[PDB]
Short mmCIF file of all heavy atoms in Angstrom, two decimals:
data_model
loop_
_atom_site.label_atom_id
_atom_site.label_comp_id
_atom_site.label_asym_id
_atom_site.label_seq_id
_atom_site.Cartn_x
_atom_site.Cartn_y
_atom_site.Cartn_z
N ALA K 1 0.82 -1.21 0.00
CA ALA K 1 0.00 0.00 0.00
C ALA K 1 0.87 1.28 0.00
O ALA K 1 0.43 2.37 -0.34
CB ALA K 1 -0.96 -0.06 1.19
N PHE K 2 2.16 1.07 0.35
CA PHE K 2 3.17 2.11 0.23
C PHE K 2 3.44 2.47 -1.26
O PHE K 2 4.14 3.42 -1.55
CB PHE K 2 4.45 1.66 0.95
CG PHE K 2 5.34 2.79 1.39
CD1 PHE K 2 5.10 3.44 2.60
CD2 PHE K 2 6.42 3.18 0.61
CE1 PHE K 2 5.92 4.48 3.02
CE2 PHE K 2 7.24 4.22 1.03
CZ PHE K 2 6.99 4.87 2.23
N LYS K 3 2.80 1.72 -2.18
CA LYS K 3 2.84 2.08 -3.60
C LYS K 3 2.32 3.52 -3.87
O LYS K 3 2.71 4.14 -4.84
CB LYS K 3 2.04 1.06 -4.43
CG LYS K 3 2.28 1.18 -5.95
CD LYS K 3 1.00 1.16 -6.79
CE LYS K 3 0.24 -0.17 -6.68
NZ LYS K 3 -0.37 -0.55 -7.96
N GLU K 4 1.46 4.04 -2.98
CA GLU K 4 1.11 5.46 -3.17
C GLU K 4 2.36 6.35 -2.99
O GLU K 4 2.57 7.34 -3.68
CB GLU K 4 0.01 5.90 -2.20
CG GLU K 4 -0.47 7.34 -2.47
CD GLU K 4 -1.50 7.77 -1.43
OE1 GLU K 4 -2.69 7.17 -1.63
OE2 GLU K 4 -1.28 8.50 -0.52
N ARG K 5 3.19 5.89 -2.04
CA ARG K 5 4.46 6.51 -1.72
C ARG K 5 5.58 5.92 -2.63
O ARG K 5 6.74 5.84 -2.24
CB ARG K 5 4.76 6.28 -0.22
CG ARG K 5 3.80 7.00 0.74
CD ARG K 5 2.47 6.26 1.02
NE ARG K 5 2.55 5.51 2.27
CZ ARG K 5 1.45 5.00 2.87
NH1 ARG K 5 0.25 5.15 2.31
NH2 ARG K 5 1.56 4.37 4.04
N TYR K 6 5.17 5.57 -3.87
CA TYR K 6 6.09 5.08 -4.91
C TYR K 6 7.09 6.16 -5.37
O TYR K 6 8.01 5.91 -6.14
CB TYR K 6 5.27 4.47 -6.07
CG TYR K 6 6.08 4.20 -7.31
CD1 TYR K 6 6.77 3.00 -7.46
CD2 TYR K 6 6.18 5.17 -8.31
CE1 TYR K 6 7.57 2.79 -8.58
CE2 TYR K 6 6.98 4.96 -9.42
CZ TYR K 6 7.68 3.77 -9.56
OH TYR K 6 8.48 3.52 -10.66
N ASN K 7 6.93 7.37 -4.82
CA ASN K 7 8.03 8.34 -4.96
C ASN K 7 9.34 7.79 -4.35
O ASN K 7 10.43 8.24 -4.68
CB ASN K 7 7.65 9.68 -4.31
CG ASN K 7 6.33 10.25 -4.86
OD1 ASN K 7 5.41 10.55 -4.12
ND2 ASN K 7 6.28 10.37 -6.20
N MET K 8 9.16 6.79 -3.46
CA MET K 8 10.25 5.97 -2.92
C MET K 8 10.01 4.52 -3.43
O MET K 8 8.97 4.21 -3.99
CB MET K 8 10.25 6.08 -1.38
CG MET K 8 9.62 7.36 -0.79
SD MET K 8 10.25 8.92 -1.47
CE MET K 8 12.02 8.59 -1.53
N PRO K 9 11.02 3.61 -3.25
CA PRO K 9 10.99 2.31 -3.91
C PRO K 9 10.01 1.30 -3.25
O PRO K 9 10.08 1.04 -2.06
CB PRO K 9 12.43 1.81 -3.78
CG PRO K 9 12.98 2.50 -2.53
CD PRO K 9 12.21 3.82 -2.43
N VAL K 10 9.11 0.75 -4.10
CA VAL K 10 8.17 -0.27 -3.65
C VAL K 10 8.01 -1.29 -4.79
O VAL K 10 7.67 -0.92 -5.91
CB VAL K 10 6.79 0.34 -3.27
CG1 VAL K 10 6.33 -0.12 -1.88
CG2 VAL K 10 6.77 1.88 -3.36
N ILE K 11 8.27 -2.58 -4.47
CA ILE K 11 8.22 -3.64 -5.48
C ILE K 11 7.02 -4.56 -5.20
O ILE K 11 7.09 -5.48 -4.40
CB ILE K 11 9.52 -4.46 -5.51
CG1 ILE K 11 10.76 -3.54 -5.57
CG2 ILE K 11 9.52 -5.46 -6.68
CD1 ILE K 11 12.07 -4.29 -5.85
N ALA K 12 5.94 -4.30 -5.97
CA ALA K 12 4.72 -5.10 -5.90
C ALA K 12 4.98 -6.61 -6.14
O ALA K 12 4.33 -7.48 -5.58
CB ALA K 12 3.69 -4.56 -6.90
N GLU K 13 5.99 -6.85 -7.01
CA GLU K 13 6.39 -8.23 -7.29
C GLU K 13 6.94 -8.92 -6.03
O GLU K 13 6.64 -10.07 -5.74
CB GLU K 13 7.39 -8.24 -8.48
CG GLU K 13 8.76 -8.90 -8.24
CD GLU K 13 9.63 -8.88 -9.50
OE1 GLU K 13 9.32 -8.35 -10.52
OE2 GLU K 13 10.79 -9.53 -9.32
N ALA K 14 7.79 -8.15 -5.31
CA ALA K 14 8.57 -8.77 -4.24
C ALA K 14 7.64 -9.22 -3.13
O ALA K 14 7.57 -10.39 -2.79
CB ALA K 14 9.63 -7.78 -3.72
N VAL K 15 6.89 -8.23 -2.63
CA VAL K 15 5.86 -8.46 -1.61
C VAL K 15 4.92 -9.63 -1.99
O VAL K 15 4.67 -10.52 -1.19
CB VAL K 15 5.11 -7.14 -1.38
CG1 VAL K 15 5.98 -6.15 -0.58
CG2 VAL K 15 4.61 -6.51 -2.70
N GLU K 16 4.44 -9.59 -3.25
CA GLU K 16 3.56 -10.67 -3.71
C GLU K 16 4.25 -12.04 -3.59
O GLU K 16 3.65 -13.01 -3.14
CB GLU K 16 3.08 -10.38 -5.15
CG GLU K 16 2.06 -11.40 -5.68
CD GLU K 16 2.72 -12.71 -6.14
OE1 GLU K 16 3.83 -12.80 -6.55
OE2 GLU K 16 1.89 -13.77 -6.01
N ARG K 17 5.52 -12.07 -4.02
CA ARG K 17 6.27 -13.32 -4.07
C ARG K 17 6.78 -13.74 -2.67
O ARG K 17 7.10 -14.90 -2.43
CB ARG K 17 7.45 -13.11 -5.02
CG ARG K 17 8.19 -14.42 -5.38
CD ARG K 17 9.70 -14.21 -5.49
NE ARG K 17 10.23 -13.82 -4.18
CZ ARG K 17 11.40 -13.16 -4.02
NH1 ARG K 17 12.17 -12.92 -5.08
NH2 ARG K 17 11.79 -12.76 -2.81
N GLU K 18 6.87 -12.75 -1.78
CA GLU K 18 7.29 -13.00 -0.40
C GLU K 18 6.19 -13.77 0.33
O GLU K 18 6.45 -14.62 1.17
CB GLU K 18 7.57 -11.67 0.31
CG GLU K 18 8.93 -11.04 -0.04
CD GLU K 18 10.11 -11.92 0.38
OE1 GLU K 18 9.87 -12.59 1.52
OE2 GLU K 18 11.11 -12.04 -0.26
N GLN K 19 4.96 -13.42 -0.06
CA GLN K 19 3.83 -14.13 0.51
C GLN K 19 3.77 -15.57 -0.07
O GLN K 19 3.81 -15.76 -1.28
CB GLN K 19 2.56 -13.33 0.22
CG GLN K 19 1.39 -13.84 1.05
CD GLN K 19 0.54 -14.86 0.32
OE1 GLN K 19 0.84 -15.35 -0.76
NE2 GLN K 19 -0.60 -15.08 0.97
N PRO K 20 3.69 -16.60 0.81
CA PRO K 20 3.54 -17.97 0.34
C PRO K 20 2.26 -18.22 -0.48
O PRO K 20 1.15 -18.15 0.03
CB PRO K 20 3.52 -18.83 1.62
CG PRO K 20 4.10 -17.93 2.72
CD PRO K 20 3.81 -16.50 2.27
N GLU K 21 2.49 -18.61 -1.76
CA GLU K 21 1.41 -18.90 -2.71
C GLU K 21 0.25 -19.74 -2.11
O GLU K 21 -0.90 -19.60 -2.48
CB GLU K 21 1.98 -19.59 -3.96
CG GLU K 21 2.78 -20.88 -3.67
CD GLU K 21 2.74 -21.85 -4.86
OE1 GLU K 21 2.38 -21.56 -5.96
OE2 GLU K 21 3.12 -23.09 -4.49
N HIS K 22 0.63 -20.62 -1.16
CA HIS K 22 -0.30 -21.49 -0.46
C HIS K 22 -1.54 -20.73 0.04
O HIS K 22 -2.67 -21.15 -0.14
CB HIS K 22 0.42 -22.14 0.73
CG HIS K 22 1.73 -22.75 0.28
ND1 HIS K 22 2.92 -22.12 0.41
CD2 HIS K 22 1.94 -24.00 -0.32
CE1 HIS K 22 3.84 -22.97 -0.11
NE2 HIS K 22 3.27 -24.11 -0.55
N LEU K 23 -1.24 -19.59 0.70
CA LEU K 23 -2.29 -18.76 1.28
C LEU K 23 -2.52 -17.52 0.41
O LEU K 23 -2.91 -16.48 0.94
CB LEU K 23 -1.94 -18.38 2.74
CG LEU K 23 -0.50 -17.88 2.99
CD1 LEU K 23 -0.44 -16.61 3.85
CD2 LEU K 23 0.35 -18.97 3.65
N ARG K 24 -2.28 -17.61 -0.92
CA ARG K 24 -2.30 -16.42 -1.78
C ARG K 24 -3.56 -15.54 -1.58
O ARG K 24 -3.51 -14.32 -1.57
CB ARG K 24 -2.11 -16.81 -3.26
CG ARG K 24 -1.90 -15.61 -4.19
CD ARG K 24 -3.10 -15.30 -5.10
NE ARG K 24 -3.20 -16.32 -6.14
CZ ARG K 24 -3.88 -16.13 -7.30
NH1 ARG K 24 -4.56 -15.01 -7.50
NH2 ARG K 24 -3.85 -17.07 -8.24
N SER K 25 -4.69 -16.26 -1.39
CA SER K 25 -5.96 -15.60 -1.11
C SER K 25 -5.86 -14.60 0.06
O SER K 25 -6.35 -13.49 -0.01
CB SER K 25 -7.04 -16.66 -0.83
OG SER K 25 -8.31 -16.11 -0.51
N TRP K 26 -5.16 -15.04 1.13
CA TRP K 26 -4.98 -14.22 2.33
C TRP K 26 -4.37 -12.85 1.97
O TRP K 26 -4.80 -11.82 2.46
CB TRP K 26 -4.11 -14.97 3.36
CG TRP K 26 -3.94 -14.21 4.67
CD1 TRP K 26 -2.72 -13.82 5.24
CD2 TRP K 26 -4.97 -13.74 5.57
NE1 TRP K 26 -2.94 -13.16 6.41
CE2 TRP K 26 -4.31 -13.11 6.66
CE3 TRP K 26 -6.34 -13.85 5.56
CZ2 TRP K 26 -5.04 -12.55 7.68
CZ3 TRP K 26 -7.08 -13.28 6.60
CH2 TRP K 26 -6.43 -12.65 7.66
N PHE K 27 -3.36 -12.90 1.06
CA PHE K 27 -2.73 -11.64 0.65
C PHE K 27 -3.75 -10.74 -0.04
O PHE K 27 -3.82 -9.55 0.21
CB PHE K 27 -1.55 -11.90 -0.31
CG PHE K 27 -0.47 -10.84 -0.25
CD1 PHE K 27 0.13 -10.53 0.96
CD2 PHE K 27 -0.03 -10.19 -1.40
CE1 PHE K 27 1.17 -9.62 1.03
CE2 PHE K 27 1.00 -9.26 -1.33
CZ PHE K 27 1.61 -8.98 -0.12
N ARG K 28 -4.54 -11.40 -0.91
CA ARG K 28 -5.52 -10.67 -1.69
C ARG K 28 -6.56 -9.97 -0.79
O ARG K 28 -6.77 -8.77 -0.87
CB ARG K 28 -6.17 -11.62 -2.72
CG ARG K 28 -6.20 -11.01 -4.12
CD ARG K 28 -4.79 -10.91 -4.75
NE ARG K 28 -4.53 -9.54 -5.19
CZ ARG K 28 -3.54 -9.22 -6.05
NH1 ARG K 28 -2.72 -10.16 -6.52
NH2 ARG K 28 -3.39 -7.96 -6.44
N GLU K 29 -7.15 -10.79 0.10
CA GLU K 29 -8.17 -10.32 1.03
C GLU K 29 -7.62 -9.21 1.92
O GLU K 29 -8.21 -8.14 2.08
CB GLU K 29 -8.69 -11.51 1.87
CG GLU K 29 -9.41 -12.58 1.03
CD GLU K 29 -10.61 -11.99 0.29
OE1 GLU K 29 -11.63 -11.71 1.14
OE2 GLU K 29 -10.65 -11.78 -0.88
N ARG K 30 -6.44 -9.50 2.48
CA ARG K 30 -5.77 -8.50 3.29
C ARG K 30 -5.44 -7.25 2.49
O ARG K 30 -5.44 -6.15 3.04
CB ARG K 30 -4.51 -9.08 3.95
CG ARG K 30 -4.83 -9.77 5.27
CD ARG K 30 -5.33 -8.75 6.32
NE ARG K 30 -6.76 -8.90 6.59
CZ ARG K 30 -7.31 -8.56 7.78
NH1 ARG K 30 -6.54 -8.15 8.79
NH2 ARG K 30 -8.63 -8.64 7.94
N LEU K 31 -5.18 -7.43 1.18
CA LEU K 31 -4.86 -6.28 0.36
C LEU K 31 -5.98 -5.24 0.42
O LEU K 31 -5.71 -4.06 0.61
CB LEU K 31 -4.50 -6.67 -1.09
CG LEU K 31 -3.05 -6.33 -1.49
CD1 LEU K 31 -2.69 -4.87 -1.22
CD2 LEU K 31 -2.06 -7.30 -0.85
N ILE K 32 -7.24 -5.71 0.29
CA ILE K 32 -8.37 -4.77 0.39
C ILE K 32 -8.35 -4.03 1.75
O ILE K 32 -8.52 -2.82 1.83
CB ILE K 32 -9.71 -5.49 0.13
CG1 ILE K 32 -9.73 -6.15 -1.26
CG2 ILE K 32 -10.92 -4.55 0.29
CD1 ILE K 32 -9.65 -7.68 -1.19
N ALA K 33 -8.08 -4.82 2.80
CA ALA K 33 -8.01 -4.24 4.14
C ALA K 33 -6.93 -3.14 4.23
O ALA K 33 -7.12 -2.05 4.76
CB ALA K 33 -7.76 -5.36 5.16
N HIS K 34 -5.77 -3.47 3.65
CA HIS K 34 -4.65 -2.54 3.67
C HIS K 34 -4.87 -1.36 2.74
O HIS K 34 -4.33 -0.28 2.97
CB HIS K 34 -3.36 -3.27 3.29
CG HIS K 34 -2.96 -4.09 4.49
ND1 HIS K 34 -2.56 -3.57 5.67
CD2 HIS K 34 -2.97 -5.48 4.60
CE1 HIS K 34 -2.33 -4.62 6.47
NE2 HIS K 34 -2.56 -5.78 5.85
N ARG K 35 -5.69 -1.59 1.71
CA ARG K 35 -6.06 -0.50 0.83
C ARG K 35 -6.84 0.54 1.64
O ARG K 35 -6.52 1.73 1.61
CB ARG K 35 -6.85 -1.00 -0.39
CG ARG K 35 -5.95 -1.77 -1.36
CD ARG K 35 -5.16 -0.85 -2.29
NE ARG K 35 -3.99 -1.56 -2.81
CZ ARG K 35 -4.07 -2.54 -3.74
NH1 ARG K 35 -5.25 -2.85 -4.28
NH2 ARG K 35 -2.97 -3.19 -4.10
N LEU K 36 -7.82 0.02 2.42
CA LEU K 36 -8.59 0.89 3.32
C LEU K 36 -7.64 1.69 4.25
O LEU K 36 -7.72 2.90 4.39
CB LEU K 36 -9.70 0.09 4.03
CG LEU K 36 -9.56 -0.20 5.55
CD1 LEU K 36 -9.77 1.06 6.41
CD2 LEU K 36 -10.52 -1.32 5.96
N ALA K 37 -6.69 0.92 4.83
CA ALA K 37 -5.74 1.54 5.75
C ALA K 37 -4.79 2.53 5.05
O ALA K 37 -4.26 3.44 5.67
CB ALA K 37 -4.93 0.45 6.45
#
């Protein structure tokens, strides 16, 4: 969500890949939550 602050470095790939694919849904669902935040 620091992608808004992409004036500094943020890698959407890295974070996505850091999250274990097993629970990929969790990242997605949480993403909406973090979007709110």
Side-chain angles (χ1 to χ4, degrees):
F2 203 84
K3 193 226 296 217
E4 186 184 286
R5 294 83 97 166
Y6 168 86
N7 305 125
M8 335 308 317
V10 231
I11 311 190
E13 124 178 4
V15 286
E16 185 282 332
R17 190 217 64 202
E18 281 297 326
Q19 193 266 8
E21 56 153 14
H22 310 97
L23 46 134
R24 189 252 287 201
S25 178
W26 184 238
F27 209 55
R28 228 70 234 197
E29 296 301 288
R30 273 295 109 152
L31 244 307
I32 301 109
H34 285 293
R35 289 278 158 73
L36 109 72

